[PDB]
Design a protein around this ligand. Structure first.
Ligand SMILES: CCC(=O)N1CC2(CCN(c3nc(OC4CCN(CC)CC4)nc4c(F)c(-c5c(C)ccc6[nH]ncc56)c(Cl)cc34)CC2)C1
Ligand SMILES: Nc1nc2c(ncn2[C@@H]2O[C@H](COP(=O)(O)OP(=O)(O)O)[C@@H](O)[C@H]2O)c(=O)[nH]1
Ligand SMILES: [Mg+2]
Length: 169
């Protein structure tokens, strides 16, 4: 069983917890405590390889943490999540990638950009915006809904494949 340390980042309210819970429990939670930051485990077979995913769902404080660095340092892949009806959460992606790059000291970190809440009408971040950003970074963009579960497996499996492509697992 190979292990993969995944870290889910993004602004409050984008659906980091809901996405993780969908993967790890197959249900949609509508009010998961915003103060709970924890690691979760899922056993999945991905391309005939039994994987144990260790998924860190971030929460809490924003100011430069020194132990944030630590878990961020050992994470092998990062889901960068924004919500398509939250323009600021998309803008914040520049900052999350900047910070991930600094800690990993690389422009080549396994990362997937996730645009969540695709089930909601009248998005404020259009697909072109998200594609242009993912293309600039050289990473996949995946649209998700934690509500309907559409794209959830895609997002997490893709990230596992990005980790494999960067390093032997
Ligand atoms: C509602 C509860 C909830 O769901 N959560 C998720 C939550 C975690 C904390 N989070 C962050 N916020 C900001 O900065 C803020 C001011 C500046 N704007 C842009 C100008 C962006 C926002 N920086 C962050 C940051 F740098 C990192 C980070 C990274 C990636 C890598 C190495 C690192 N070492 N140390 C911090 C750090 C991390 Cl992990 C989170 C935030 C806010 C959102 C709280
Ligand atoms: N319509 C819709 N709501 C969502 C989706 N994902 C999360 N939510 C809701 O958005 C709010 C924040 O979700 P949460 O997972 O707590 O976000 P976090 O703060 O990033 O962990 C909650 O009310 C969730 O039920 C989604 O895909 N669609
Ligand atoms: Mg949460």
């Amino acid at each position: 069983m190979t292990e993969y340390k995944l870290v889910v980042v993004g602004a409050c309210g984008v659906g980091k917890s809901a996405l993780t819970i969908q993967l790890i429990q197959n249900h949609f939670v509508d009010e998961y405590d915003p103060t709970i930051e924890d690691s979760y485990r899922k056993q999945v077979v991905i391309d005939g390889e039994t994987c144990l995913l260790d998924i860190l769902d971030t929460a809490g404080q924003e100011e430069y943490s020194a132990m944030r660095d630590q878990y961020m340092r050992t994470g092998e892949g990062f889901l960068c999540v924004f919500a398509i009806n939250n323009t600021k959460s998309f803008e914040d992606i520049h900052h999350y990638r900047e910070q991930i790059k600094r800690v990993k000291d690389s422009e080549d970190v396994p990362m997937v950009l996730v645009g969540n809440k695709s089930d909601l009408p009248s998005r404020t971040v259009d697909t072109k915006q998200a594609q242009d950003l993912a293309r600039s970074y050289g990473i996949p963009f995946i649209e998700t809904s934690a509500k309907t579960r559409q794209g959830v497996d895609d997002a997490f499996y893709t990230l596992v494949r990005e980790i494999r492509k960067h390093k032997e697992k």
